[PDB]
């Protein structure tokens, strides 16, 4: 009757440094922490604003997915939090470079402020494969 | 070992204005995108403010639920995102016309802005039936 | 084939002041509503500000978890919604009084406004154990 729950941690994404995990896996469902454009090495936000931060946040998410045996095709839901709702056109273009098709469900909105003054934070839910459309 | 994962897509609700699906069904859990009060025919927000937008957003969610085999009773969690926290009474009154009992868990708060200048966005998680309640 | 959906209800946490349930359990997953620093017996926010409200909100979350046969170790994801981003450190130190290892995944950010003028709201997803690593 037990289920495995394991905390994902990879050095290719910025480390926790706090009472949170990069992501938690529990019977094929992966809850991924909100990712911002932090460089895993420098511990600082990359420079350049939303375009550069979005790219970095998505790479960070990709490395976490990888450590769980997944890729972007496994993501079923994201939340995209913005410092400015008007950055959507830019953000969408970058988002589509990682999420190429069969897009996750999504919620999206502008918040009042994000950690470290970032312009974007992306959280996600993913499911460990293998996956099928067939009702079997 | 395979789990069923399928996108839900109905013309009864608005087409995506960005790279997202209306909902994703995965092993009985349905993740529904944030819905706003956009008319499915025109692709524009309905006129009249928060009360009319909330209604349309819920109708849109309802059509997505239907296409996933589900109705409002299958919803287990929602997030209500408001342009103005003072609209809560108005929003709840409308919310209760759709969700009538065994209510979903819920988070609610005011955000800075929503897509298309909407006054409300509602996301949800539902579970595909059969479901039997204690 | 049929999954049971159970609404979690306990007088040890504040009763709902809107159309929502404290938490909903379905097939092992427990979706917990956003908790604020309200005292169950008065149904009013505690005094003292964010520090006091955060402790109360977590305490309310703990009672809801216990009512579902869980504790804080069962939590796999939280969202911390702040009225002020600068309250983060204060809230984080309190959060660590409850979560001690195998930490939940997390999102944190500042919103425009929370219900009843609250300085913090915390929602969560938890999974019914036993949960193991092996």
Curated annotation (Swiss-Prot), chain A:
CDD domains: YjgF_YER057c_UK114_family (cd00448). The modification Phosphoserine is found at residue 135. One of its GO terms (cellular component) is mitochondrion. Expressed predominantly in liver and kidney. Lower levels in lung and brain. GO terms for molecular function: 2-iminobutanoate deaminase activity; 2-iminopropanoate deaminase activity; deaminase activity; mRNA binding; RNA binding; RNA endonuclease activity, producing 3'-phosphomonoesters. It holds the Pfam family Ribonuc_L-PSP. InterPro entries: RidA, RidA_CS, RutC-like_sf, YjgF/YER057c/UK114. Its EC number is 3.5.99.10. The modification N-acetylserine is found at residue 1. Keywords: Acetylation, Cytoplasm, Hydrolase, Lipid metabolism, Mitochondrion, Nucleus, Peroxisome, Phosphoprotein, RNA-binding. The modification Phosphothreonine is found at residue 73. GO terms for biological process: L-threonine catabolic process to glycine; lipid metabolic process; mRNA catabolic process; mRNA destabilization; negative regulation of translation. It catalyses: 2-iminobutanoate + H2O = 2-oxobutanoate + NH4(+); 2-iminopropanoate + H2O = pyruvate + NH4(+). It is found in: Cytoplasm; Nucleus; Peroxisome; Mitochondrion. The modification N6-succinyllysine is found at residues 12, 59, 66. Catalyzes the hydrolytic deamination of enamine/imine intermediates that form during the course of normal metabolism. May facilitate the release of ammonia from these potentially toxic reactive metabolites, reducing their impact on cellular components. It may act on enamine/imine intermediates formed by several types of pyridoxal-5'-phosphate-dependent dehydratases including L-threonine dehydratase. Homotrimer. Interacts with YTHDF2. This is 2-iminobutanoate/2-iminopropanoate deaminase. The gene is RIDA.
UniProtKB/Swiss-Prot annotation, chains B, C:
The modification N-acetylserine is found at residue 1. It is found in: Cytoplasm; Nucleus; Peroxisome; Mitochondrion. GO terms for molecular function: 2-iminobutanoate deaminase activity; 2-iminopropanoate deaminase activity; deaminase activity; mRNA binding; RNA binding; RNA endonuclease activity, producing 3'-phosphomonoesters. Expressed predominantly in liver and kidney. Lower levels in lung and brain. Homotrimer. Interacts with YTHDF2. Catalyzes the hydrolytic deamination of enamine/imine intermediates that form during the course of normal metabolism. May facilitate the release of ammonia from these potentially toxic reactive metabolites, reducing their impact on cellular components. It may act on enamine/imine intermediates formed by several types of pyridoxal-5'-phosphate-dependent dehydratases including L-threonine dehydratase. Also promotes endoribonucleolytic cleavage of some transcripts by promoting recruitment of the ribonuclease P/MRP complex. Acts by bridging YTHDF2 and the ribonuclease P/MRP complex. RIDA/HRSP12 binds to N6-methyladenosine (m6A)-containing mRNAs containing a 5'-GGUUC-3' motif: cooperative binding of RIDA/HRSP12 and YTHDF2 to such transcripts lead to recruitment of the ribonuclease P/MRP complex and subsequent endoribonucleolytic cleavage. This is 2-iminobutanoate/2-iminopropanoate deaminase. It comes from Homo sapiens (Human).
């Amino acid at each position: 009757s037990s289920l495995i729950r394991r905390v994902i941690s990879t050095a290719k994404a910025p480390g926790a440094i706090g009472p949170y995990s990069q992501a938690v896996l529990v019977d094929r469902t992966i809850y991924i922490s909100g990712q911002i454009g932090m460089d895993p090495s420098s511990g600082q936000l990359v420079s350049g604003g939303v375009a550069e931060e979005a790219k970095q946040a998505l790479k960070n998410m990709g490395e976490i997915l990888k450590a769980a045996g997944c890729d972007f095709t496994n993501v079923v839901k994201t939340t995209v939090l913005l410092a400015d709702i008007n950055d959507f056109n830019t953000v969408n273009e970058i988002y589509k470079q990682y999420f190429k098709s069969n897009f996750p469900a999504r919620a999206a909105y502008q918040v009042a402020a994000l950690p470290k003054g970032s312009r974007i934070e992306i959280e996600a839910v993913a499911i460990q494969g293998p996956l099928t459309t067939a009702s079997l």
